[PDB]
Amino acid sequence: QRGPNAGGVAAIVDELPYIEVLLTNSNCKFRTVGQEFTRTGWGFAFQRDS
Amino acid sequence: SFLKPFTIEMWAVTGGFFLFVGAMVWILEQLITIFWFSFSTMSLGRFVLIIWLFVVLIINSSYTASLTSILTIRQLTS
Amino acid sequence: PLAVDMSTAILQLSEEGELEKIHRKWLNYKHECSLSLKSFW
DSSP, rough: OOOSSSTTOOOOOOOOHHHHHHHHHHOOOOOOOOOOOOOOOOOOOOOOTT | OOOHHHHHHHHHHHHTTTTTHHHHHHHHHOOTGGGGGTTTTOOOHHHHHHHHHHHHHHHHHOOOOOOHHHTTTTTTTO | OOOOOOOOHHHHHHTTEEEEEEEHHHOOOOOOOOOOOOOOO
């Protein structure tokens, strides 16, 4: 809301399932201006070679 | 956003100094006041029309330059 | 020789993040505010 000035930032870079929460939680004032530039996915982190 | 490229005071000065310049035609010369518009379609009164031409050839040539300079900075913003 | 290890004290005070926290204690002052038209004669 403060934009690039007043100590704020221009853009937030987050993962896609965080951002699809933020659009619904706020009003219709933001939109993902690009596509995904690193498309990997999530997962469970185990002990190595378990 | 249409009338934006001039200040609100400029739209009254420009529309004001077409009637005061239009009243200068009456010195060389509702239904009676429309007779000057039939005379100002296209001596000393011709010299009034020469300077008034280069006024309108500036208010044409600045309203373009402040409708461009809005429609570019609106595009080339951050 | 006090200047050598209070040089290493400040770098160990800064990697931990204590220079900013003291800066938040005193200097937390951020209240800083911030088309085309035409006029001539």
